[PDB]
Amino acid sequence: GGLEVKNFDFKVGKFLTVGGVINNYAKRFSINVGESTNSLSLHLDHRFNYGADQNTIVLNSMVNSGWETEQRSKNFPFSAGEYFEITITFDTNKFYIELLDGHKLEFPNRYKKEALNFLSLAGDARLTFVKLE
Amino acid sequence: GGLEVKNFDFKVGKFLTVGGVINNYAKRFSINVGESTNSLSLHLDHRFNYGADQNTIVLNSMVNSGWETEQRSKNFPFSAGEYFEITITFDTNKFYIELLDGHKLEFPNRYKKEALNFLSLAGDARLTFVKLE
Numbered sequence A, B: 001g002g003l004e005v006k007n008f009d010f011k012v013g014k015f016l017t018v019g020g021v022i023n024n025y026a027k028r029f030s031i032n033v034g035e036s037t038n039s040l041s042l043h044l045d046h047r048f049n050y051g052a053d054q055n056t057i058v059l060n061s062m063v064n065s066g067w068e069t070e071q072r073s074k075n076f077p078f079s080a081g082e083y084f085e086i087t088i089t090f091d092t093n094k095f096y097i098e099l100l101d102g103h104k105l106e107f108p109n110r111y112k113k114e115a116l117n118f119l120s121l122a123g124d125a126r127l128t129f130v131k132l133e
C-alpha cells in the first residue's frame, strides 16, 4: 500500500517538502525517508513530550536490526494542532533539513544513498502533501 | 525511481490533488492513476497539439496492456510554461476530475475499483505536487 508516485525521483539535488497538520494533542511526529519502514536514512522525530525529550528533535537512521546513534536538536518551531512544513535535500555526505521558521539541521548520510524510494509520516500528525522539485 | 508515500491511501472518498509545471512548447502531457504503469483506471491526456487533437483532454483506461475507448473534453484551461493542478475523486461507478477552473469532468470507474496505488505523469510536464485528503 501507500501511493507509488513514479515521477518522484528523490535523488541528490532534489528538494522534498512535506506539509500537514499536527494533531490537537501530540507527543511526537516523525518524517522518515529511506528504503522502507524498517530501513531509513533519516528519521526526523519531533518530540513535544517523549520521555526526557521535551520540545526536542531526535534524528537517527535505522537498519533492519535496529536504530543507530541518535542526534538531538532543541530547535523546535512546532505546536500541537498547527500546520507543519519541512524541506529536505541531501548529498552523498549529508542531509540538509529546513524547518518552517528557517531553522536548519544536518544529519550524516550514513548509508551513502544517492536516491531514496520511501517516505512516511508517523505519530501524532497527518501528512497533507508531498512536493518534490 | 519513484517514491512510495506510505500515508497516502487513495481510496473511495479521498481527494487526490496532483500539481506540476507544463513545459514551454508543450505538445501533450498526461496524468495516470491505476495499479501500475500498464494497468490504469484513468488516463488524462491533455493534448495541446497531438495529431487531430488540439486543446483537448483525452480520457481513457488501460486493461492488460491495451487502451480502451476514449472519451474527450474541450475544457482546456492549460498553458505551456504554467503551473497546473487537478483534483481527482472517485466512487465505485465514476471518477470525478476538477480543474483549477472549477470545470469538472466525469469518467466511468470501468473496473469498479475501491482504491488505487499508482500515480504517474508523462509528456511535456513535470509532476511536482501530490496532495491527498
Ligand SMILES: OC[C@H]1O[C@@H](O[C@H]2[C@H](O)[C@@H](O)[C@H](O)O[C@@H]2CO)[C@H](O)[C@@H](O)[C@H]1O
Pocket: A043, A045, A051, A058, A059, A060, A067, A068, A070
Ligand atoms: O532513535 C529513534 C527511535 O527512538 C526510540 O526511542 C528511544 C529513545 O530515543 C531513547 O532515548 C531511549 O533510550 O530508547 C528508546 C527506545 O529505543 C523510539 O521508540 C523510536 O520510535 C524511534 O523514534
Ligand SMILES: OC[C@H]1O[C@@H](O[C@H]2[C@H](O)[C@@H](O)[C@H](O)O[C@@H]2CO)[C@H](O)[C@@H](O)[C@H]1O
Pocket: B043, B045, B058, B059, B060, B067, B068, B070
Ligand atoms: O487512449 C489514450 C492513448 O491514446 C493514444 O493515441 C491514440 C489516439 O488518441 C486515437 O485517436 C488514435 O486513433 O489512436 C492513437 C493510438 O492508440 C496515445 O498514443 C497514447 O499515448 C494514449 O494517450
